[PDB]
């Protein structure tokens, strides 16, 4: 992978001389101590070095370049100053949600691109004017430099995120063409899960004496997790068993997974009916359940939106994941409990041989 050439570690966000407003925003978002990546990559960025971080897909990898572009913005100057590139509209969009989140108590202005029902309206915004931070796909962005809805003049921070992804979605050309439009002055940050030739040679052709941060990868592993299946013949008797379990383990934090939103609503309100207060899951009304789960305080989500589940001692599959790959994303990484039906009998034995793993029966 890439050879690390910089690792000094910063324990607290307090020691990074961030704005206080930036500080208030990163605490309010739920963070406490800086993660692997954060203790290593924030400073370097903030200090202006081109940085090339090979790290797993963001949570607070996102928070990292986010925190340093915000720390560097000139609130007073109304013109777009940092440009960030992601591989999908979806993904650019979450980036800007994180940015707005942390950037909340400073005047920071941030915008992702699309998409396109009201692009008319999107463009007339962009210039003029004129967001401080714009995120978007290499294609979109470049199309906007070309049309001149976006000025490279004041852009001083150019961050390529999940470069390995972007390149392979077919964006190599649009990435280079953007480069050659930004000042020979611009700081470059490129984070990437993996560092193939393609990605490397970008690094190699755009960065000054860059720093390499590494961050050891955290593989999911159903190794430290006890897995059980409790046998419930009919789905009828599922809700029933759930609450029995709720009082014979009286858990205080647990995530329960469901296959559709509708069946979440069902279960949630059939449990509030039963005196078991419990949470169900839009960013502000959501941000809570994630802001309040994150810093801390039973959650029943789909599966799609499935919050860091690893700091949760108990996972329960009320429904069983139709996508086998998706199981480890719910449970593993302990313990976790499976509710299997007669019908579901076979379906579980598959999960078991998929990850070469054993799932025993609910004991006492």
């Amino acid at each position: 992978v890439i050879e690390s050439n910089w690792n000094e570690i910063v324990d607290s966000f307090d020691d990074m001389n961030l704005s206080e407003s930036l500080l208030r925003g990163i605490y309010a978002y739920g963070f406490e101590k800086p993660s692997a990546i954060q203790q290593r990559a924030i400073l370097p960025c903030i200090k202006g070095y081109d940085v090339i971080a090979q790290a797993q897909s963001g949570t607070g990898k996102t928070a990292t370049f986010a925190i340093s572009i915000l720390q560097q913005i000139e609130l007073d100057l109304k013109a777009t100053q940092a440009l960030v590139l992601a591989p999908t509209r979806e993904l650019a969009q979450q980036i800007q949600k994180v940015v707005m989140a942390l950037g909340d108590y400073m005047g920071a202005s941030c915008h992702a691109c699309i998409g396109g029902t009201n692009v008319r309206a999107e463009v007339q915004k962009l210039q003029m004017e004129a967001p401080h931070i714009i995120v978007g796909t290499p294609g979109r962005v470049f199309d906007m430099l070309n049309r001149r809805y976006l000025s490279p003049k004041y852009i001083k921070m150019f961050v390529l995120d999940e470069a390995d992804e972007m390149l392979s979605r077919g964006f190599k050309d649009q990435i280079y063409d953007i480069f050659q439009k930004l000042n020979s002055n611009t700081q470059v940050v490129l984070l990437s899960a993996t560092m193939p030739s393609d990605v490397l040679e970008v690094t190699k052709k755009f960065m000054r004496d860059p720093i390499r941060i590494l961050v050891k990868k955290e593989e999911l592993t159903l190794e430290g997790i006890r897995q059980f299946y409790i046998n419930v013949e009919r789905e009828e008797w599922k809700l029933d068993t759930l609450c029995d379990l709720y009082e014979t383990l009286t858990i205080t934090q647990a995530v329960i997974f469901i296959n559709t939103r509708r069946k979440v609503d069902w279960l949630t309100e059939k449990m509030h009916a039963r005196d078991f207060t419990v949470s169900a899951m839009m960013d502000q009304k959501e941000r809570d359940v994630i802001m309040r789960e994150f810093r801390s305080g039973v959650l029943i989500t789909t599966d799609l939106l499935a919050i860091d589940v690893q700091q949760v001692s108990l996972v329960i599959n009320y429904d069983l994941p139709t996508n086998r790959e998706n199981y480890i994303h719910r449970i593993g990484r302990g313990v976790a409990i499976n509710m299997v039906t007669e019908e579901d009998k076979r379906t579980l034995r598959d999960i078991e041989t998929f990850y070469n793993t054993s799932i025993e029966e609910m004991p006492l």
């Binding site: 396109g116 979605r169 593989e219 139709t322 086998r324 790959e325």
Partner: protein, 278 residues
């Protein structure tokens, strides 16, 4: 209107994960969409355009299993007219959005959810023609798939040929790109287990060589996570007293192989350590 996407987007997306042609189909019924019905395959395709192949596949099937349940022949007529409208706009966020939309149409017509000489009677802009030429050639002649919510021993079939084919192609990237395409990265011990078996079962030196090379270059492309690689060998260290029924010798072989591996560094001194013998 834009209150639309704010609504369907999150069931189309939820769907790429439960995979229920059905549940989707219900919830749309109860939203009682108007003419603006024909804006649902557009939303769906154009989302899957930024998804994986899976989602691309998943969508084409949703476009089928939705047409005649809760959607007129004639939504899909236009839904596709809009996709060609927005092709220049879509290619901003998906570069191969042309050829791709094309493959959607090819299949579209094919599930018969689409008019027969549609392309033909669609006679400014490379992007749509480009995307119609795809559909044309495709027809005159999958997306393949597909991973995840596939059937397990279906995956096995694929892994099998992956290996089988490799042994005659001698093409390592080729292998990687199919293992990679299946989209089941937590199932790669299958690839490893199957492959070791081929070596265990073979005669003469090629199997062994060819599979030790593939297994190195896989480990090296970080394609086979170190964890995977281990559930692999354990499955073998396990079955070998059973495999020995079909291959005597299987022992003094599989260990000669664990040795090559260790020596090549693909496995820990402690997996090599943990190998059986009798």
């Amino acid at each position: 209107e834009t209150a639309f996407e704010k609504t369907l987007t999150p069931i189309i997306q939820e769907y790429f994960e439960h995979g229920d042609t059905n549940e989707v189909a219900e919830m749309l019924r109860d939203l009682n969409l108007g003419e603006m019905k024909s804006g649902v395959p557009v939303l769906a395709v154009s989302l899957a355009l930024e998804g994986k192949a899976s989602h691309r596949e998943m969508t084409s099937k949703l476009l089928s299993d939705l047409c005649g349940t809760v959607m007129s022949t004639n939504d899909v007529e236009k839904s596709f007219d809009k996709l060609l409208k927005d092709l220049p706009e879509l290619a901003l966020d998906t570069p191969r959005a042309p050829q791709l939309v094309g493959q959607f149409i090819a299949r579209a017509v094919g599930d018969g959810i689409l008019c027969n000489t549609y392309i033909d009677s669609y006679k400014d802009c490379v992007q749509a023609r480009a995307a119609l030429d795809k559909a044309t050639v495709l027809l005159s002649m999958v997306w393949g798939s597909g991973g995840g919510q596939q059937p397990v021993n279906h995956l096995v079939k694929e892994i099998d040929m992956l290996l089988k084919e490799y042994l005659l192609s001698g093409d390592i990237s080729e292998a990687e790109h199919c293992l990679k395409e299946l989209e089941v990265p937590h199932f790669h011990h299958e690839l490893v287990y199957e492959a070791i078996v081929m070596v265990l079962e073979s005669t003469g030196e090629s199997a062994f060589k060819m599979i030790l090379d593939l297994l190195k270059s896989l480990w090296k492309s970080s394609t086979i996570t170190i964890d995977q690689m281990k559930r692999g060998y354990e499955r073998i260290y396990n079955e070998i007293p059973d495999i020995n029924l079909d291959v005597p010798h299987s022992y003094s072989v599989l260990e000669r192989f664990v040795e090559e591996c260790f020596q090549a560094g693909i496995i820990s001194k402690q997996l090599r350590d943990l190998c059986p013998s009798r």
